[PDB]
UniProtKB/Swiss-Prot annotation, chains A, B:
Shown segment, full-protein numbering: 10 to 381 of 440
Compartment(s): Nucleus; Cytoplasm, Cytosol
Record note on what altering residue 30 to A does: Loss of function, homodimerization and interaction with COP1
One GO term describing the cellular component: chromatin
Protein name as it appears in the record: Ultraviolet-B receptor UVR8
Length: 372, 372
C-alpha cells in the first residue's frame, strides 16, 4: 500500500503563495510564481503543491513566507536560504537581485537560528540566544537599527543587548517582538497606531509597549498594518488598523494601544496569524476564529461579507485545527487529522487545489491530506 | 461594411494592466483586475480589451495608469475619475477605500486639468495654468508638500507658486517635473540617485536639477527608480537606477545626475516612457528603441536577455510608431496605421491578445487594430 501522506509540519502563507514543510525535510510550494517566490527556477504559478527539489537532502526544519519571497533554514547545516523578489535587500545577500531558486544567506552561515520572521520588504532572525538580526527595507525604521537606510545584509539590533528576545513578527513596514520575560515591543512605520505605543509616529529602534495591563505577552503576530498579541492568561489583544474590522472589536476604529478582544475573553488563545486585512486566532482546544476583510472569502465562514467580530471557521466533523497562516487574500490551516485546508482567493493557484474558483469556506488540499 | 476600428488616441500601461482611450470617448481596459484597476465592477483579469461601460457618454479625453489603479478625466465636465487599489489615498477621495468602478474625485471637480501623472502610490495633476496638486503616499516626500504625511485628498504644491509647470512624472515613490521654460525638478525618494540632484538623499519639496548642461528640458518620464528627460535639441538623458541597464549607458552603473545617452545622440527623441526596470524612447521619425530588463521579453527585441544599450524594436513593414507606454513587465505601442501592439509578460492578460504565452517581440492586438 502507498505510504501515508507525510506529516505536515509547517504551513506559511505569503501574499499570493503558499509553502509547507513535510516530514522527511521536504519543502513544497504553490501559488504565484512570478517573482521567484516558489523557488522552482521558472516564473510560473503552480496550482498544486510542488516539491522544491533544490532543498531535498538539505535538512530544512523551518519555512517562512514574506509577501513575495520565502525563507527556509536548516538547523543541522546552520544555513538559511532565501528566494523571490530581491528589491531593497529583503533576501539578505548584499545585493538586490531577485532569485528564482534558493541561495544560502552567507551572513547567517554557522549561526544558531531560533526563528525567522518576514514582512513585505524586510526580515528578521532570532538566534538561540535571543539576539536579533534584521535586513531589507528600512525607510521607516522597521529594521530597528536607529536610522532609515536599507540594509542589504543582516545586522544586529544593538538596542536589544542584554534583552533576550523570544520571537519577532513583521508586517508591511513595521515590526514587533516579545521578550522571554513577557515584554512587548514595536518599531517601524506607525501611522495607524500599529506599534501599540499610543500614537501615530514611527520608531527607528524598538520601543516597549507600556499599556498591557501589567499582563505579560507570550506571542505576537503582524498583519499588513495591524498587530496581534496574546497574554500569559490566553487573552487576545489587537491594535493598529481596523478599516476592514481586522482588529475584531465589533467596529472599524483603529486602536493606538493594545486592546483586549472582549468577545473571545472566555477562550484561551494558543496561536495567532495576521493577514493583509484579516486575522485568525486558534484556541487551546483547536477552534479557529477568523475576522476582517472577506471580499474573496478568506475569513472562511461561507460568505463574502467583511466580519468585524470573530466568527468560528468550521471544518468537517469539527476536527480540531492545529496550525493556521494568513496571506493577502487567502488562508491555510492544518488539522489534527493531518489534513490541510485552504480558502479565499485562488487565481494564482495559492489554494493548492488545482485550477479553481475562489472559495469562501475551507477546502481540502488532497495532495497533502489524509482525507479526500 | 463594418465601421473602421476607432482611432486609438491614448494608451497607458500600469504594472500589470493596460488602458486605452478610443475616438468617440470610449475607454477600454484589460489585464490584471484583482485590485479593481480595470473598473468593470468585478475583480477578474481580462485578456482582451474590454469597454468600460460606466464611462460611456462622460466625455473622457485622457486616461493614465498607476501601478494598480487608473485615472481618467473629462475636460467638458471638468471631472477626474479614479479606481483601483485605495491604500494611502492614491485615489484621492479622502479615504483609502479600493474602488472597482470609477468615482469622481470631488476635490478636482470644476478644475481645468492639463495632465495627470500616476506612480505606484501617489498621483499629481497639472492645471491649465501650470499649478500642481498631489495626493497619496508621502512617506519620502514624493507629494512635494514639505513633510512626510500621506494625503488622502489633492493638495497644492505651494513650492511651485509663480512657476508654470508644463508636465510632471511619477515613479514608485519619486516625482519629477519640467517647467514651461525648460527647468527640471525632482523630489521624493532619492536613494538611487533618481532625483538627478547629485546625491542619494530624499527631498520633501521640489528641487531644481542644476546639471543639465544649460540645456532646457521639454519632457520627463519616470520608471520605478529611474528618470528620463529630453532636451530642446532632442538629446536623451537618464538618471537613477541601472541595475538592469535601464539607463541605457552600456553598463549597470547608477547615475546621480542626468547623463546623456550617447548611443542615441544622432537621433531626435520625441517621446519617452519608463517601465519598472526597462525604458522606451521614440524618435521623431517613428523609430522605437527599448532597453533594460527583458526577462519576460518586454524590451521587444526577440529574446529574453537584458539590454544595457538601446535596441530598435521592429514592426511589420517598418510602420512608424506613434505612441509607447511601459508597464512592470510589458510594453504597449500604437503605430501610424492605427494598429496597437503589445509585448512582454502575458499571464494577467495585459497583452490584450486573448489567452497567450509571454511574447518577446511585438504582437498585434486584433480587437483594436486595422490590420490582422
Amino acid at each position: 500500500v502507498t505510504a501515508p501522506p507525510r506529516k505536515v509540519l509547517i504551513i506559511s502563507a505569503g501574499a499570493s503563495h503558499s509553502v509547507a514543510l513535510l516530514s522527511g525535510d521536504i519543502v513544497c510550494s504553490w501559488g504565484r510564481g512570478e517573482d521567484g517566490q516558489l523557488g522552482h527556477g521558472d516564473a510560473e504559478d503552480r496550482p498544486s503543491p510542488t516539491q522544491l527539489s533544490a532543498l531535498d537532502g538539505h535538512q530544512i526544519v523551518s519555512v517562512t513566507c514574506g509577501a513575495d519571497h520565502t525563507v527556509a533554514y536548516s538547523q543541522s547545516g546552520m544555513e538559511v536560504y532565501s528566494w523571490g523578489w530581491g528589491d531593497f535587500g529583503r533576501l539578505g545577500h548584499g545585493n538586490s537581485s531577485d532569485l528564482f531558486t534558493p541561495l544560502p544567506i552567507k551572513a547567517l552561515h554557522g549561526i544558531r537560528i531560533k526563528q525567522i520572521a518576514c514582512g513585505d520588504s524586510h526580515c528578521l532572525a532570532v538566534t538561540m540566544e535571543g539576539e536579533v538580526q534584521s535586513w531589507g527595507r528600512n525607510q521607516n525604521g522597521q529594521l530597528g537599527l536607529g536610522d532609515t537606510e536599507d540594509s542589504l545584509v543582516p545586522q544586529k539590533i544593538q538596542a536589544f543587548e542584554g534583552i533576550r528576545i523570544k520571537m519577532v513578527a513583521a508586517g508591511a513596514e513595521h515590526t514587533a517582538a516579545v521578550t522571554e520575560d513577557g515584554d512587548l515591543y514595536g518599531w517601524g512605520w506607525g501611522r495607524y497606531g500599529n506599534l501599540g505605543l499610543g500614537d501615530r509616529t514611527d520608531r527607528l529602534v524598538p520601543e516597549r509597549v507600556t499599556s498591557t495591563g501589567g499582563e505579560k505577552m507570550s506571542m505576537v503576530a503582524c498583519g499588513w498594518r495591524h498587530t496581534i498579541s496574546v497574554s500569559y492568561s490566553g487573552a487576545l489583544y489587537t491594535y493598529g488598523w481596523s478599516k476592514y474590522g481586522q482588529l475584531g472589536h465589533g467596529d472599524l476604529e483603529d486602536h493606538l494601544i493594545p486592546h483586549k478582544l472582549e468577545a473571545l475573553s472566555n477562550s484561551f488563545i494558543s496561536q495567532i496569524s495576521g493577514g493583509a486585512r484579516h486575522t485568525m486566532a486558534l484556541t487551546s482546544d483547536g477552534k479557529l476564529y477568523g475576522w476582517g476583510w472577506n471580499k474573496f472569502g478568506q475569513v472562511g465562514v461561507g460568505n463574502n461579507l467583511d466580519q468585524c467580530s470573530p466568527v468560528q471557521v468550521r471544518f468537517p466533523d469539527d476536527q480540531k485545527v492545529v496550525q493556521v497562516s494568513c496571506g493577502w487574500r487567502h488562508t491555510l490551516a492544518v488539522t489534527e487529522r493531518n489534513n490541510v485546508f485552504a480558502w479565499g482567493r485562488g487565481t494564482n493557484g495559492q489554494l493548492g487545489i488545482g485550477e479553481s474558483v475562489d472559495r469562501n469556506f475551507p477546502k481540502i488540499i488532497e495532495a497533502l491530506s489524509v482525507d479526500g
